[PDB]
Curated annotation (Swiss-Prot), chain A:
It comes from Mycoplasma pneumoniae (strain ATCC 29342 / M129 / Subtype 1). One of its GO terms (molecular function) is structural constituent of ribosome. The gene is rpsD. One of the primary rRNA binding proteins, it binds directly to 16S rRNA where it nucleates assembly of the body of the 30S subunit. With S5 and S12 plays an important role in translational accuracy. This is Small ribosomal subunit protein uS4. SMART domains: Ribosomal_S4, S4. Keywords: Ribonucleoprotein, Ribosomal protein, RNA-binding, rRNA-binding.
Curated annotation (Swiss-Prot), chain B:
The gene is fusA. Catalyzes the GTP-dependent ribosomal translocation step during translation elongation. During this step, the ribosome changes from the pre-translocational (PRE) to the post-translocational (POST) state as the newly formed A-site-bound peptidyl-tRNA and P-site-bound deacylated tRNA move to the P and E sites, respectively. Catalyzes the coordinated movement of the two tRNA molecules, the mRNA and conformational changes in the ribosome. Belongs to the TRAFAC class translation factor GTPase superfamily. Classic translation factor GTPase family. EF-G/EF-2 subfamily. The lineage of its organism: Bacteria, Bacillati, Mycoplasmatota, Mycoplasmoidales, Mycoplasmoidaceae. It comes from the Bacteria. It is found in: Cytoplasm. This is Elongation factor G.
Curated annotation (Swiss-Prot), chain C:
Binds directly to 16S ribosomal RNA. Belongs to the bacterial ribosomal protein bS20 family. Gene3D superfamilies: Ribosomal protein S20 (1.20.58.110). It comes from the Bacteria. SUPFAM superfamilies: Ribosomal protein S20. Pfam families: Ribosomal_S20p. This is Small ribosomal subunit protein bS20. One of its GO terms (molecular function) is structural constituent of ribosome. One of its GO terms (cellular component) is ribosome.
Swiss-Prot record, chain E:
InterPro entries: NA-bd_OB-fold, Ribosomal_uS17, Ribosomal_uS17_bact/chlr, Ribosomal_uS17_CS. One of the primary rRNA binding proteins, it binds specifically to the 5'-end of 16S ribosomal RNA. The gene is rpsQ. The keyword Ribonucleoprotein applies. It comes from the Bacteria. GO terms for molecular function: rRNA binding; structural constituent of ribosome. It comes from Mycoplasma pneumoniae (strain ATCC 29342 / M129 / Subtype 1). This is Small ribosomal subunit protein uS17. GO terms for cellular component: cytosolic small ribosomal subunit. Keywords: Ribonucleoprotein, Ribosomal protein, RNA-binding, rRNA-binding. One of its GO terms (biological process) is translation.
Length: 203, 135, 77, 80, 83
RNA sequence: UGUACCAUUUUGAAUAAGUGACGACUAACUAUGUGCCAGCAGUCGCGGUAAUACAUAGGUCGCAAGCGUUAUCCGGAUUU
RNA sequence: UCUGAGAGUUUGAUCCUGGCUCAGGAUUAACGCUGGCGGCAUGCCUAAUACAUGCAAGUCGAUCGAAAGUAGUAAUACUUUAGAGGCGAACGGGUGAGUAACACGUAUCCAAUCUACCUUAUAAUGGGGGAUAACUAGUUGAAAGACUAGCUAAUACCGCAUAAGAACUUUGGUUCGAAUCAAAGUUGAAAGGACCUGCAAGGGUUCGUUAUUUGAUGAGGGUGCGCCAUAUCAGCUAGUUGGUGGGGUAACGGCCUACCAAGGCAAUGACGUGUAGCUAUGCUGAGAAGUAGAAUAGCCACAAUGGGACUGAGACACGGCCCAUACUCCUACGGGAGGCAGCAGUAGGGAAUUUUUCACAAUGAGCGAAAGCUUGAUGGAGCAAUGCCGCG
């Protein structure tokens, strides 16, 4: 999946709350482990470096809602620039158009954010994106098109916008500026991209 | 090209065992007479030594052969080579603006010219009855 | 197929006839020089070679080399 | 032009009497897009003079780009 | 000759041909994998211009040129004689 | 090329899902038939007195308009 | 240092020796399943086999006589040249059969080599004579073709004038297999068509040619360096090996020959053998190295195989010619014919390898003062998730 259709499952099983109390939430049933008839501490050797590298990769590319092919495309594009794979890769992944639109507080869910930005109502670099594939940079102004300034769901989301020490959003005008990269301290606490760094052996 | 009035199609409106394809080849050679290639002495005469008529029906079958004859364009089409069926004779009839009905005198007992005539008589298309078995 | 290929075929076959004639005349002048070896025939060969080099069929190097070989025989006499 | 459609990239090269574009060239004239009216070509009023004085005039579509540099205004009297 | 410097120096071996010498050149190249210098032997046909004759059993300097005879595409240039 | 880009230009959750396998190597497995038969399988190797590796229902993860498969060079084998 | 994965395989158990496997990018892909678009780029490795079909460089009168007719009584304003003659025809593209090498990468010897237009410009377009096609007539002819007879123009064929410069004889000078200059012998450049002014001359004006001459252009032979396999291939090689003379492609070169000769390569394995098109470019890994040089840019090779000649500056010429060999159509069995290893596309093997592709719009050449034309080169497009890319 580059998508979902029951996100609460992914949030609970990955061990990371994609929404803190809106995806690992008491909405009836609520879980924090692997669900089903196979909830089990597998005595078979299912745990190694490979396993946790995979698990962290799952968490990171399922909180974004983005496809893995664009994950590898971002890795390759950053490979054109010398630096550190871990921090640069995670910062570029955070700088995803849909991820940043959600970070603005413009959509209740990453899937909904992706659907909205694809719908042709997000202006970036004076280009209304018909496909949310434009990776932001520090200071990239995302604008909400004239259509999505009258949409009730994203109106309520935007009016409840989220500000962080590395972005800011003007919710009344439905606009957002990606202030800076989350360098090493504004990243999620239970998420580590270094595993994806060590996931390769062909560097 | 030749005038619109002079675009007339003609399908061989008969069946084999009647000297049909012999007459079709005769008409094709008569209206397709060209001498710069030497064809005049290459298909001069056509006649049977008939012990097989399938060869006559097949090898001479003209699916669509167009020529010109001084006043008009003659579209000779010998699609039918079967004794009794409807597809080839019917497409020939649909194409032709006029029909030639190849009948017999030596073998007047040919059974499958009634249905061919009835098919041609549906659209009232002009028909010329021609008999070649008189030898 | 290119019509200009056959056009240059016509032109080059006529050039074939003309150049056969002219090169045969030059070679018979060279033969006459090599038979009666003298400066006058050397000058005739020089004039013929200059004419052929001016025509622009074969480069002047062949004319110069053939006349140098002729005048070498001249110096041998 | 060449490359990707609706994003053409014209690579201008040299020729004597037979050779194609961007194949065998005496010297790469430079890069101009047919959709771009200004060239980043290797044109400095010197290579053009080299190509003219050495014979084998290059492709006949950057003549205006050489005209803007005044190449002809000196060459047509240098030859004279 | 205006001919410029090119390396063809070697030990001339024989002059059994009329004013033509066979020269043995020992050229050292490098092993591509194990990285050790190894020598190889080559033969060259140097043309003796008639005014110079390659004295055999010695080192001679050959220099490149257009062919002089069949499989004779070099001319002898310099010689170091016996001592 | 009436292409490209623009403007919910209009109604609408609507317009698109498949693959591997879950014992390890190397993430994904609980039950049902099955007596080394059925069938699985790249290595270990799986089934002969109750099957989570087989076959299936299913849940599961890796993905995805591509999914798995073999193909092909080196390194993971300093295991030339 | 950018950088580097492990586990599983044996004896009751332990280890060791050694080996195999998955664990990675990546597709001319294909393949199951199904399928969103477009962008984007890919697209016979095998078959270099024939190539059917269109197509793969056309432009020329400002070179010419007339053909040929629109308006005109005609002359002629006018259309191009069938034909003579000009350039490009070798461009382009293709595959790599074969080619393992100066082809290549690199500096060069070129003392031996030209290059048409072009280019550094000095010299020229003086003057003709007569043809020849076009045109006309006859002939063989089913056509294919085909011979004979004449006429005429030019930028057409063939001499001379001038002709710096220059080719090239004899002497001096100078010079690292010749550079350089003085004296001096011989000797040769055609061709003019067209437009305005001017009686004309002349001036302006555009083509076509002329020598001389700085280079490019394509390439020539050699060239140190490296350039596949080949010992379960050890001897191979009679221009072999080199010399004088003569001839020779553009030229040095036994390039080739008369004459004179017996030597040349080689256990660091000679010769032979078959193959790969070589460099840049194509991936994997840190690295060692391996993996193709398919197609491609350069070069190189065939362009149905093997010759010959001509042209062109460069060809012994894919789409010129003649021929032998493979083939073929029609036919009255007399006869004539050509090549996609050009584009596609066809036939096949394969898993499959694109249009039986559009305009020269932009870009190349070629040529025309110029209008411009063609390119199956190019630029597009189709085409198959064909591969990547993003999307829901």
């Amino acid at each position: 999946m580059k998508y979902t259709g029951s996100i609460f499952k992914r949030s609970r099983r990955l061990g990371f709350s994609l929404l803190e109390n809106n995806k690992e939430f008491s909405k009836g049933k609520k879980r924090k482990t692997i669900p089903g008839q196979h909830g089990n501490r597998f005595r078979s050797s299912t745990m190694s470096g490979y396993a946790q590298q995979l698990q962290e990769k799952q968490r990171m590319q399922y909180m974004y809602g983005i496809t893995d092919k664009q994950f590898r495309r971002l890795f390759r594009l950053v490979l054109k620039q010398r630096g550190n794979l871990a921090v640069n890769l995670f910062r570029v992944l955070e700088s995803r158009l849909d991820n940043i639109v959600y970070r603005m507080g413009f959509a209740p869910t990453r899937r909904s954010a992706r659907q909205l930005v694809n719908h042709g109502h997000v202006l970036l670099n004076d280009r209304t994106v018909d496909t949310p594939s434009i990776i932001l940079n520090p200071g990239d102004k995302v604008r909400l098109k004239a259509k999505t300034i009258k949409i009730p769901i994203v109106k309520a989301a935007s009016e409840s916008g989220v500000v962080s020490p590395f972005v800011e959003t003007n919710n009344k005008t439905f606009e957002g500026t990606y202030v800076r990269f989350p360098e090493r301290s504004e990243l999620p606490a239970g998420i580590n991209e270094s595993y994806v760094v060590e996931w390769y052996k062909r560097l | 090209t030749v005038d619109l009035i002079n675009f007339r199609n003609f399908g061989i409106m008969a069946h084999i065992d009647a000297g049909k394809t012999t007459t079709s080849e005769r008409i094709l050679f008569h209206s397709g007479r060209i001498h710069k290639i030497g064809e005049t002495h290459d298909g001069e005469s056509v006649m049977d030594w008939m012990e097989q008529e399938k060869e006559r029906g097949i090898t001479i079958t003209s699916a669509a052969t167009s020529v010109s004859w001084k006043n008009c364009s003659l579209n000779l089409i010998d699609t039918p080579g079967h004794v009794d069926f409807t597809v080839e004779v019917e497409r020939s009839l649909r194409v032709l603006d006029g029909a030639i009905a190849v009948l017999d005198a030596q073998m007047g007992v040919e059974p499958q010219t009634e249905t061919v005539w009835r098919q041609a008589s549906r659209y009232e298309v002009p028909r010329i009855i021609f008999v070649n078995k008189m030898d | 197929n290119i019509k200009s290929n056959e056009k240059r075929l016509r032109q080059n076959i006529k050039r074939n006839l003309n150049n056969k004639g002219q090169k045969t005349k030059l070679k018979t002048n060279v033969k006459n020089f090599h038979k009666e070896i003298n400066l006058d025939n050397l000058g005739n060969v020089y004039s013929q070679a200059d004419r052929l080099a001016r025509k622009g069929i074969i480069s002047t190097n062949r004319a110069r080399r053939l006349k140098s070989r002729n005048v070498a025989v001249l110096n041998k006499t | 032009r060449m490359g990707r459609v609706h994003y053409p990239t014209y690579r201008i090269v040299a020729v004597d009497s037979r050779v194609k574009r961007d194949g065998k060239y005496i010297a790469l004239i430079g890069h101009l897009n047919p959709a771009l009216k200004e060239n980043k070509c290797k044109i400095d009023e010197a290579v053009a003079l080299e190509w003219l004085n050495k014979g084998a005039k290059p492709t006949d579509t950057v003549r205006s780009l050489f005209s803007q540099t005044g190449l002809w205004k000196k060459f047509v009297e240098s030859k004279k | 000759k205006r001919n410029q410097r090119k390396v063809l120096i070697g030990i001339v071996k024989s002059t059994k041909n009329a004013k033509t010498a066979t020269v043995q050149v020992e050229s050292r190249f490098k092993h591509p994998l194990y990285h050790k210098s190894v020598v190889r032997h080559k033969k060259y046909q140097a043309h003796n211009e008639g005014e110079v004759l390659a004295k055999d059993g010695d080192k001679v300097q050959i220099v490149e040129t257009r062919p002089l005879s069949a499989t004779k595409r070099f001319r002898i240039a310099k010689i170091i004689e016996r001592a």
